[PDB]
Amino acid sequence: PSSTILIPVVVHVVYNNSAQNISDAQIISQIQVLNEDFRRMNADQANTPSAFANLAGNANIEFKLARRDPNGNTTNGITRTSTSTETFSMEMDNVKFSNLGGNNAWNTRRYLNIWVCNLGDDLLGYAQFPFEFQTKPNTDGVVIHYKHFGRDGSAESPYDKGRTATHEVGHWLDLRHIWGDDGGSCSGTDNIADTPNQGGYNEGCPSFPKTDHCTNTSPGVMFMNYMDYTYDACMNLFTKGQVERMRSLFDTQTGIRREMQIYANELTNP
Amino acid sequence: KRDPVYFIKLSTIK
Ligand SMILES: [Ca+2]
Ligand SMILES: [Ca+2]
Ligand SMILES: [Zn+2]
């Protein structure tokens, strides 16, 4: 049993052309996907292998667009900023500052900021981890490539079901890659006991079961976990262990992100 | 998140 954790969200669309100024419907579809994936309401939970069904987690984390901005003014939770920057840089975090062609974050203690923009080459999106929250508060949040934001619509296959944001919100909530970021070895860890030890990342739509040198017997590795690198339509769960780690950030006494719950209701009611 | 299949379209042409 658990109480619902409520996350006020602001989406910052930063566009260099009309194609990048994505629709309100496309944004609403991304918030819908986050609520499905973090509340185990995703229809494709029907695709989770039965061997992992008893490990699938319901994070009971709800996302709502903000209705009050940091100045106390009414908002629909969507900002739109034209820019002369053609491609934003993860190294510079330039999408996160209006001085650098982007848009400043809204009080990161009270809002999840999701920037949407053009990113380079094979980067679908990126996050800032909770360990950087005290030292880098103004860049906390998530950035998603405009071609991989929302479900269907303007999103491009095979990353067209809004799972880049599920994966990045996972990192923003302290989750690490399921394979342990160790280039294929068995010695790295994601520090989640119920995710099977896994060599390297998976891609595309793997066949179940997929064993590797780290988990050499069926049911193998959880390549359909959101924290892998598989295609959007082929990922369909968080585990109960990942849910425990994410929710710990909202512990009322020690949670790094505990402040977000104090005014979440006030900031998401018009 | 990185797309591991991104450069296929680029590497198979001039
Ligand atoms: Ca693990
Ligand atoms: Ca590994
Ligand atoms: Zn990742």
Numbering used by the authors:
A (entry chain A): 58 to 327
B (entry chain B): 1 to 14
Paper text:
We next obtained a product complex of mature mirolysin with a tetradecapeptide (Lys1–Lys14) occupying S1′ and further primed sub-sites of the cleft plus a citrate in S1 (CIT−1). However, a tetradecapeptide from the lipoprotein was found covering sub-sites S1′ to S6′ and more of the primed side of the active-site cleft [for sub-site and peptide substrate nomenclature, see Schechter & Berger and Gomis-Rüth, Botelho et al.]. Moreover, a citrate anion was attached to S1 on the non-primed side. Thus, we serendipitously trapped a product complex, which revealed the molecular determinants of substrate binding and catalysis of mirolysin (see Section 3.5). Citrate CIT−1 mimics an amino acid in S1 after catalysis. The side chain of Lys1 intrudes into the S1′ specificity pocket and binds the main-chain carbonyl of Thr287 at the pocket bottom. Lys1 Nζ is linked to Asp289 Oδ1 through an internal solvent-mediated salt bridge, which explains the preference for basic residues in S1′.
